[PDB]
Amino acid sequence: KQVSWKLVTEYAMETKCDDVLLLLGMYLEFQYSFEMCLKCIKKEQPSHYKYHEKHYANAAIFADSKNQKTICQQAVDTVLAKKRVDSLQLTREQMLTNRFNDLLDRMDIMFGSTGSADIEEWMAGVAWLHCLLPKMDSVVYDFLKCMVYNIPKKRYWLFKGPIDSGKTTLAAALLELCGGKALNVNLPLDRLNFELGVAIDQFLVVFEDVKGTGGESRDLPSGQGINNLDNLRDYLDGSVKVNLEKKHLNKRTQIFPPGIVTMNEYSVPKTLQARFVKQIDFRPKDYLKHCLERSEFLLEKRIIQSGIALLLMLIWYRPVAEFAQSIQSRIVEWKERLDKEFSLSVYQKMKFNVAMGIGVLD
Amino acid sequence: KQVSWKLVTEYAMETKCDDVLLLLGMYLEFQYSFEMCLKCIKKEQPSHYKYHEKHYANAAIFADSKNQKTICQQAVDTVLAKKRVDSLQLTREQMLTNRFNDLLDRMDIMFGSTGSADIEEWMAGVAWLHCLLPKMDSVVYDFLKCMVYNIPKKRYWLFKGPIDSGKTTLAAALLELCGGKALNVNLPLDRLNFELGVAIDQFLVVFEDVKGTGGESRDLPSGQGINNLDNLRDYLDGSVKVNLEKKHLNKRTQIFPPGIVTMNEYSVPKTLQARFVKQIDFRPKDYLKHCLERSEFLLEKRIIQSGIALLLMLIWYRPVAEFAQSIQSRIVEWKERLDKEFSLSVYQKMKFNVAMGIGVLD
Amino acid sequence: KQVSWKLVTEYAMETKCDDVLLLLGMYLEFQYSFEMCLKCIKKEQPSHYKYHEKHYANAAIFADSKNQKTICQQAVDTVLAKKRVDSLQLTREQMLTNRFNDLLDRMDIMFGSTGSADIEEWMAGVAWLHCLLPKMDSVVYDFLKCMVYNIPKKRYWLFKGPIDSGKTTLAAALLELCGGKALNVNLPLDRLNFELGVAIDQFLVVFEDVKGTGGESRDLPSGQGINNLDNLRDYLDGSVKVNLEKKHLNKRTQIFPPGIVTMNEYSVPKTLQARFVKQIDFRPKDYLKHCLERSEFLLEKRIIQSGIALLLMLIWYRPVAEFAQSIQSRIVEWKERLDKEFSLSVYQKMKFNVAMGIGVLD
Amino acid sequence: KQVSWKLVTEYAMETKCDDVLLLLGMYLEFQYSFEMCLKCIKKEQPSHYKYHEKHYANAAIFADSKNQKTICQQAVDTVLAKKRVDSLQLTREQMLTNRFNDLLDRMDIMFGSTGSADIEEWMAGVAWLHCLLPKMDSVVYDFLKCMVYNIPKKRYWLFKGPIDSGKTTLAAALLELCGGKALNVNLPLDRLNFELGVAIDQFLVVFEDVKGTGGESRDLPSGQGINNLDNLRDYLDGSVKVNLEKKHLNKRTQIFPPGIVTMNEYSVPKTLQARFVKQIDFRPKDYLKHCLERSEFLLEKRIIQSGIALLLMLIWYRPVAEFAQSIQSRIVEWKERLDKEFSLSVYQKMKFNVAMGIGVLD
Amino acid sequence: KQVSWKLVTEYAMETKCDDVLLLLGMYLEFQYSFEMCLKCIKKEQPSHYKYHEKHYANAAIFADSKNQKTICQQAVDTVLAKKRVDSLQLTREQMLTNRFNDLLDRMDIMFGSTGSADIEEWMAGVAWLHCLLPKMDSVVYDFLKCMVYNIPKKRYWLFKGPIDSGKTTLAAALLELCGGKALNVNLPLDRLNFELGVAIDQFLVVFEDVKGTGGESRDLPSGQGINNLDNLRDYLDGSVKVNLEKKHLNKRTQIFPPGIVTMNEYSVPKTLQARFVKQIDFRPKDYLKHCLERSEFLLEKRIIQSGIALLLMLIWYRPVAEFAQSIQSRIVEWKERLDKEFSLSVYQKMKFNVAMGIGVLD
DNA sequence: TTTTTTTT
Ligand SMILES: Nc1ncnc2c1ncn2[C@@H]1O[C@H](COP(=O)(O)OP(=O)(O)OP(=O)(O)O)[C@@H](O)[C@H]1O
Ligand SMILES: Nc1ncnc2c1ncn2[C@@H]1O[C@H](COP(=O)(O)OP(=O)(O)OP(=O)(O)O)[C@@H](O)[C@H]1O
Ligand SMILES: Nc1ncnc2c1ncn2[C@@H]1O[C@H](COP(=O)(O)OP(=O)(O)OP(=O)(O)O)[C@@H](O)[C@H]1O
Ligand SMILES: Nc1ncnc2c1ncn2[C@@H]1O[C@H](COP(=O)(O)OP(=O)(O)OP(=O)(O)O)[C@@H](O)[C@H]1O
Ligand SMILES: Nc1ncnc2c1ncn2[C@@H]1O[C@H](COP(=O)(O)OP(=O)(O)OP(=O)(O)O)[C@@H](O)[C@H]1O
């Protein structure tokens, strides 16, 4: 009798697991009899309780194997290969669809009866977030389209505002929605090339709080970020491929992803501002501050930064046809649930409440 | 007949051996006759005497294997896998339960029939610790709670006071209770960027004495930390995930852990000052150090900076319900032992000798 | 038939051999017929003549094997594994008496009927040696106690003094007496990461003649060595475990060994002086030079370097009660032997020759 | 009927071969019929023609093997193992006694019937070398004795003086006589760690023309060598065992070899000067150049660089009693052979020609 | 049946195949039937068409193997091993004769009826080369004999001249003539250690265009070359075996080859100046320039750089007597071909054209 | 995995 390396490879695929120890550990759990498994009876972790019965017989014989890490390494290679194929063949449209489908799957758990989350608290987050900018959901939808099209030159958005104007909050939320990375170009010009290597194969990137010079008039400390950027023109426009470092390893060539730039109100050289479409800017607004102060479970649960919160806002506001055709079925049922759960006047209470700067969950 | 790899792996799981060499050495000890194993008869180490008879026959065959380290490598992977699994499938509350459970196991054996320390020495330790700062047990319990929740921004406590004021001393014990690491930022900014990654997968972190700049106002050596820290604000508040830098080494996207700052009395820009939940002051105390020299077994045995002394201190003050709900069983069992073995009056005598700074024992 | 890996492993354990090439060479000597072995006949090395007969058969078959280095690798692992086990489970006393026993055993040879060197020379060495300092025997008792008791922060000693003050010599004797290890420091801190690997599982370590800074006014060459060590405060203080590198292997984490450091009389930072129990001066008591120049066998034989000279010094001065109990009869036995070979007059005659800087003997 | 790994190992021992590729290359040559082997018939180099006919049988089957490099590695391991066992257990006198036996064997071939060079040209070279320094052969005898005794901190000789004074020349012949390695320390320290790795198990080292600083006043180009070397006091002193690198090898711990430093006359800091027991001040000597110009065969055959020449000098000059007793039988024959083949009057005539600066011969 | 590893090794041997990928690719070409092989039928490369039909069947079986890279590894190591053997066992003269066989083989193909070299153009090259310095043929012969003798500290020639004086041109031809490699010492001192690695087992080296300092007096850019090279003084002298390394290889110890240094008019330190046996001063010359314009087939076919051009010059100018006895017969045949093909007046007309600054042809 | 590169 023999271990089926195939069945392990299935488990790795179905779970999208790609750490050889994470895989090895979880498969070994299945050696004990599913018949009595506490995690199963407690319906505790889906990547366990969905699977324990299926894999039981193979996991038992795997537990005797003299070869365990070799099997897991071949299984891990299979999952990395799948990512590699997808990265080079898929449309950007499909990638976002995949990313969206995964978030909806995790929301099925969070707000399922087994789940711990409260949909009303998360919806309170959407109201506060929606209030942050006029026509927030149109801003979000425009931004998403822009990333999916990745049209050259028309690729980069600028976020301006004072400290605590929320730009870092929203950037993080978008980055959690789409997937991507942040970068810090305030560095001197030697470190920069290794720094930029981070972007390789990412869907999206973000430039955090760049520093100009002479803004210390406005008490904004000087730095070189702008002067670095104003010499990175060819990366921003995305019109032609560039070579990206990574430490020790060889250079690789691709188009530098689209992205977002964030700053306090330093002066922007006219050369650089031409690189941006659609400069958004942010004020402070005392009532949002007072509201957070009276509904701190938002922050304490990290709701306001979540990609899940943005997805909920899109479902609440956008027409179904705006979603990619595959997920439209899941979109319909989530609209259905949300319509069933919040009658609109509930949401009007929440919005009106935030406008009064009182605690959104009155 | 041939070695059971499974039995070796059970022993590794049961004894939580991380190290291939440590595993190999101990398992080879079992090859001699259990039926007169003198180490067992001397009841020296549980890791041997609790297992030798059970593992004996397999250990005999193990000695003749041509392949020994390969068996041990796979067994060690099994233990490391269990860590990685738990590290992604638990509440912070569960982790503390496990941490405390294990320490209590050590107290059980250490103060057992093997009786290898006098509890009173630790109680003098507890008494010394408790007199350091008002309601010292509450300080532990509330800082502890604070670290369990990891609520954003409500995350950093400042410890301040002169040289040799015990701030370093306290943290070392407390960090040993919980698990985590120290850090330094008295650094030109590059060297900050090579520290950061030691925080990876750390439950908690601590800043060693921060050199502020311009310290020579106190005649303190100036160093870089104060401005660096304000220029690190988000790592404090733990609002949004990041990835962190050792030299070279790996990271996985996570929030920067909560923590503690320790300080000789440099200034703070109220920007950085606003980042904190608490200030707590320190000094040497002169009767107390004249007690230490009169009480030196405390320091010889290091108990003064054992987290065990904190665990014991908590058990003396806090009520059973205030504890991890299953382990509450063990809590009463130890409260029974402690309250039986020690009246409040004997504690008051120690506490009084502590108060005099005379050697705690009389 | 086939090689027994067991018998090779026994030889490695029994010799406590440590290097895989050394073992391979050592064992292959046994392949020749025992009956005529010249090394056996003329009793040159215990490591050979004790064993050739016992291992001849297995050595003959070993000499043919196509796997010889693999066999030796497993054996070397077995010796290393025992070291690792003992490093955790033993008391610092138990370790120290193990060390002393091997010295006693060697002396049973070196003054046995073979007795390959003449105890008078060694005692003359011991004379020059105790004559180096006030209370030298008591000073070493204080040192040894300190190293067993292994207290944090109060953990290391400093030697200071001119070129040829002898400080390095005394360290080398204490290093051998304990069986510690020695570490360079005058290097960049990346390279350090693997030198420190030698400190894994050692009773003790030493650092040497560290290049200070600003020394040039005295011709004293400044260097990175001092400033590098400014960082390493936990390693010195022994406040918590640190992980250490080892090559083609796991890293491992433990408290860093206690130790000492020596210097010629550089500057010292006020922050680091804070972390040594004891600082010791050394001087050109030039008449000692005059003697040794004229007593050269002591130096040629490295007698005044030998840890044996200190073990002899200890056997002379200290009461058997001051020794660890288990060996105490061996102390009597050797004490008697020296009394049966010497008297305080004889020592004091030699002592006075050293005091006179005249050749030790008349 | 497969390859005998034993016979391959035996050949490697006989030849004293370390490089696995050199071993592989030479052993393959034996695959063809020795019966006609031109390298045999022309008796070209002895490491072939002595051994070919014996090994041919096994060399044929070796040539078909699929494991070839693996077999050669094990044989190379055996040679390296032998060097390490000898390094620990022989007296330094024995090492040199064995070394002299090898050179004497080569002199049997050099001046045999194969007779590739005549004894008079080397004896002319001896006269040239003895003319270089006052009491040359006495200096040779002193140096050997110093290296054999290996007295700690009295281990190093400094060769100093202007360019083309001959210090490189003299160092070269000693290095051949004793066997050892050259090292260059002028390179940056971070590279240097692996340079010293070559010194493992070596008898002797020579550091070549390290560069100082400040002698630019005379145009001596400045460099790092002195400062690098001054980090290495320990390695010079031989007081204590130190740790040595190799690529992909863990550190070896041993005492670092003694030997020679050459310099054009930069200044030596006191701390470094203190570590040289002797210094020799070479000087340019016009008539040598005019002799050399008319004695070209010396340089072409590299005669004055051979340890062979120094051995011939010692045999001409020293009492038989100074040689280690085992060799003295051979010394008698070489003394006889020399006195047979040369008058003293010829040697006197030669040294006169040298003294005149003329071509050595008339 | 099974792959014959011996036959692949024979192919590698007979093609001198140093690179494992190049070997693999070419051997796999043979798996198709030679009977139709277009590379054979169009006689495109001799290292294919000579061998295809012989190796065919073993190529077909090799094409199925699962070990293909391992077989190529073994074959390539024997090619490397044979060079390693030859490096030690040949005389420098006999090496040079082997190299001349190899160039003379290539010349049989080049100037063959097959192939395309019109020897008229190459003889024009000899004319232009013979103009560059007085007594050109004597200069080349003197260099060759110097390289054979390899006299210690008389090993290096220095080429000085204005930029554009043919100095790298002449070096290029010598390097091909002798075999050997070019090095760049102007690198930063860190990289330099791996640079010198390529010298291993090479016969000759050239240092291109070393920058001095202060030559900005002529607008020579300054750089490190001269400083670095004087740190390598030991390597030039060639008396003793230096240590060399390549990436991931442990060091090899050998005598560093002789060679040429090229530079513009920088000042050169006395120490480094003393290492050169001969200096040659190149200069711009208008007639060569004006000739070369009207003679550009020389440059377009690189005749002026080729070692083949120098060989033709030697064959023209030097007696049969000066070659070694093995090649002398083949030299006579080439002398016969040249004298038949040309005549003095034809050649003299070329030199006359060049000196007149005409195109070489009229 | 070390090593090389990074890091110095
Ligand atoms: N309208 C607002 N008025 C006042 N405070 C606000 C407002 N919106 C958000 N904040 C506060 O700002 C805090 C910090 O948010 P965030 O880091 O995203 O801002 P930011 O503008 O990007 O800041 P910075 O430039 O300092 O990084 C939030 O946690 C919230 O408490
Ligand atoms: N309150 C106290 N009473 C008695 N002794 C104390 C007290 N505080 C500290 N000391 C002594 O000083 C030692 C050093 O304490 P610690 O390193 O924690 O102080 P620190 O304030 O962090 O010092 P520094 O700022 O100088 O680094 C303690 O371990 C203890 O021996
Ligand atoms: N009292 C003394 N007077 C003179 N010389 C002494 C004295 N004590 C020791 N020495 C000499 O010191 C020499 C070297 O000893 P050692 O290396 O231990 O000294 P050190 O002070 O550590 O020197 P360094 O700092 O140079 O390494 C010995 O050979 C010995 O002869
Ligand atoms: N004392 C001398 N007088 C004259 N010529 C000498 C003398 N010694 C050496 N020579 C000549 O100088 C050449 C180089 O000698 P050598 O390399 O030994 O000198 P060095 O002083 O060590 O030089 P450097 O410091 O430059 O390396 C010898 O080959 C010989 O031709
Ligand atoms: N003496 C000369 N006078 C004028 N042009 C020449 C001369 N020699 C060669 N040239 C032409 O110009 C170039 C100059 O020579 P070369 O290419 O060898 O450059 P270099 O300046 O002498 O060398 P390097 O770049 O190594 O310092 C040649 O390639 C050739 O085309």
Short mmCIF file of N, CA, C and O in Angstrom, two decimals, chain C residues 303-348:
data_model
loop_
_atom_site.label_atom_id
_atom_site.label_comp_id
_atom_site.label_asym_id
_atom_site.label_seq_id
_atom_site.Cartn_x
_atom_site.Cartn_y
_atom_site.Cartn_z
N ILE C 303 54.69 25.26 30.52
CA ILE C 303 54.17 24.85 31.83
C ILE C 303 53.35 25.97 32.45
O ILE C 303 52.23 25.75 32.93
N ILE C 304 53.87 27.20 32.44
CA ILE C 304 53.14 28.32 33.02
C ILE C 304 51.95 28.75 32.17
O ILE C 304 51.22 29.67 32.55
N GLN C 305 51.73 28.11 31.02
CA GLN C 305 50.43 28.23 30.36
C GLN C 305 49.43 27.17 30.80
O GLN C 305 48.23 27.39 30.66
N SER C 306 49.90 26.04 31.31
CA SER C 306 49.04 24.88 31.44
C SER C 306 47.98 25.08 32.51
O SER C 306 48.25 25.62 33.59
N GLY C 307 46.77 24.61 32.23
CA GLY C 307 45.76 24.53 33.27
C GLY C 307 46.17 23.59 34.38
O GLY C 307 45.77 23.76 35.53
N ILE C 308 46.99 22.60 34.05
CA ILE C 308 47.55 21.70 35.05
C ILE C 308 48.21 22.48 36.17
O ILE C 308 48.04 22.17 37.35
N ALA C 309 48.97 23.52 35.82
CA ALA C 309 49.62 24.33 36.84
C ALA C 309 48.60 24.94 37.80
O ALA C 309 48.86 25.03 39.00
N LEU C 310 47.44 25.36 37.30
CA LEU C 310 46.41 25.86 38.20
C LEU C 310 45.77 24.74 39.01
O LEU C 310 45.53 24.90 40.21
N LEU C 311 45.48 23.60 38.39
CA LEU C 311 44.94 22.49 39.17
C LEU C 311 45.92 22.07 40.25
O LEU C 311 45.53 21.77 41.38
N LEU C 312 47.21 22.08 39.93
CA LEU C 312 48.23 21.85 40.95
C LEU C 312 48.17 22.93 42.02
O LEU C 312 48.18 22.63 43.22
N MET C 313 48.10 24.19 41.60
CA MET C 313 47.99 25.28 42.56
C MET C 313 46.81 25.08 43.49
O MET C 313 46.92 25.31 44.70
N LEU C 314 45.68 24.63 42.96
CA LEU C 314 44.49 24.41 43.77
C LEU C 314 44.69 23.26 44.75
O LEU C 314 44.37 23.38 45.94
N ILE C 315 45.24 22.15 44.27
CA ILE C 315 45.57 21.03 45.14
C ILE C 315 46.49 21.45 46.28
O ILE C 315 46.35 20.98 47.41
N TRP C 316 47.45 22.33 46.01
CA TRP C 316 48.32 22.78 47.10
C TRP C 316 47.55 23.57 48.16
O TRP C 316 47.53 23.19 49.33
N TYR C 317 46.92 24.67 47.77
CA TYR C 317 46.44 25.62 48.77
C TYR C 317 45.13 25.21 49.43
O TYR C 317 45.01 25.29 50.66
N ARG C 318 44.18 24.79 48.69
CA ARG C 318 42.82 24.84 49.20
C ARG C 318 42.44 23.57 49.96
O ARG C 318 42.92 22.48 49.63
N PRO C 319 41.59 23.68 50.98
CA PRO C 319 41.13 22.48 51.70
C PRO C 319 40.19 21.64 50.86
O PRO C 319 39.47 22.15 50.00
N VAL C 320 40.19 20.33 51.12
CA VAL C 320 39.37 19.41 50.34
C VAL C 320 37.90 19.78 50.40
O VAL C 320 37.14 19.52 49.46
N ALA C 321 37.46 20.38 51.51
CA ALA C 321 36.09 20.88 51.61
C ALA C 321 35.76 21.86 50.49
O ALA C 321 34.62 21.89 50.01
N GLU C 322 36.72 22.66 50.07
CA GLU C 322 36.48 23.63 49.00
C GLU C 322 36.29 22.98 47.64
O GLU C 322 35.83 23.66 46.72
N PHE C 323 36.63 21.71 47.48
CA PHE C 323 36.38 20.97 46.25
C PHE C 323 34.97 20.39 46.23
O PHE C 323 34.37 20.12 47.27
N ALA C 324 34.45 20.19 45.02
CA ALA C 324 33.19 19.48 44.86
C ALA C 324 33.30 18.06 45.41
O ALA C 324 34.30 17.37 45.20
N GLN C 325 32.25 17.63 46.11
CA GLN C 325 32.35 16.45 46.96
C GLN C 325 32.76 15.20 46.20
O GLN C 325 33.58 14.41 46.69
N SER C 326 32.20 14.98 45.01
CA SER C 326 32.35 13.69 44.35
C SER C 326 33.81 13.28 44.14
O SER C 326 34.15 12.11 44.29
N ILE C 327 34.68 14.24 43.81
CA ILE C 327 36.09 13.93 43.55
C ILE C 327 36.98 13.99 44.78
O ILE C 327 38.18 13.70 44.68
N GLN C 328 36.44 14.36 45.94
CA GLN C 328 37.28 14.84 47.02
C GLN C 328 38.40 13.87 47.41
O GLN C 328 39.48 14.32 47.79
N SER C 329 38.19 12.56 47.30
CA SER C 329 39.28 11.64 47.59
C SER C 329 40.45 11.81 46.62
O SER C 329 41.61 11.74 47.04
N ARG C 330 40.18 12.01 45.33
CA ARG C 330 41.28 12.21 44.39
C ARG C 330 42.13 13.39 44.82
O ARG C 330 43.35 13.39 44.62
N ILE C 331 41.51 14.40 45.41
CA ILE C 331 42.25 15.54 45.92
C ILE C 331 43.18 15.09 47.03
O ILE C 331 44.38 15.41 47.04
N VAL C 332 42.65 14.33 47.99
CA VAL C 332 43.48 13.78 49.05
C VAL C 332 44.64 13.01 48.45
O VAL C 332 45.81 13.23 48.78
N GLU C 333 44.32 12.09 47.55
CA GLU C 333 45.32 11.21 46.96
C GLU C 333 46.46 11.99 46.33
O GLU C 333 47.64 11.70 46.56
N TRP C 334 46.13 13.01 45.53
CA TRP C 334 47.18 13.83 44.93
C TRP C 334 47.82 14.78 45.95
O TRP C 334 49.03 15.02 45.89
N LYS C 335 47.04 15.32 46.89
CA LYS C 335 47.63 16.14 47.93
C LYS C 335 48.71 15.37 48.66
O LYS C 335 49.85 15.83 48.79
N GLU C 336 48.37 14.17 49.12
CA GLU C 336 49.34 13.29 49.76
C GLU C 336 50.57 13.11 48.89
O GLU C 336 51.71 13.25 49.36
N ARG C 337 50.37 12.79 47.61
CA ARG C 337 51.52 12.60 46.72
C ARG C 337 52.45 13.81 46.72
O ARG C 337 53.67 13.65 46.82
N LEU C 338 51.91 15.02 46.62
CA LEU C 338 52.80 16.18 46.63
C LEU C 338 53.46 16.36 47.98
O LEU C 338 54.65 16.68 48.06
N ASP C 339 52.70 16.16 49.06
CA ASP C 339 53.31 16.20 50.38
C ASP C 339 54.40 15.15 50.50
O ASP C 339 55.46 15.40 51.08
N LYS C 340 54.15 13.98 49.93
CA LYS C 340 55.11 12.89 49.83
C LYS C 340 56.24 13.18 48.86
O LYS C 340 57.10 12.31 48.66
N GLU C 341 56.27 14.36 48.25
CA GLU C 341 57.34 14.74 47.34
C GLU C 341 57.92 16.12 47.61
O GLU C 341 58.91 16.48 46.97
N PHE C 342 57.34 16.90 48.52
CA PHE C 342 57.73 18.29 48.70
C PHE C 342 57.40 18.74 50.11
O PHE C 342 56.65 18.08 50.84
N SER C 343 57.96 19.88 50.49
CA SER C 343 57.60 20.57 51.72
C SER C 343 57.59 22.07 51.48
O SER C 343 58.21 22.57 50.54
N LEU C 344 56.88 22.78 52.36
CA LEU C 344 56.70 24.22 52.19
C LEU C 344 58.04 24.94 52.11
O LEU C 344 58.17 25.96 51.41
N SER C 345 59.05 24.43 52.81
CA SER C 345 60.42 24.90 52.64
C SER C 345 60.83 24.86 51.18
O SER C 345 61.33 25.85 50.62
N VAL C 346 60.61 23.72 50.54
CA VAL C 346 61.04 23.52 49.16
C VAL C 346 60.35 24.53 48.25
O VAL C 346 60.99 25.25 47.49
N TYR C 347 59.03 24.60 48.36
CA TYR C 347 58.28 25.63 47.65
C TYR C 347 58.83 27.02 47.95
O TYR C 347 59.07 27.82 47.04
N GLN C 348 59.04 27.34 49.23
CA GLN C 348 59.43 28.70 49.58
C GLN C 348 60.84 29.02 49.10
O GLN C 348 61.13 30.18 48.78
#
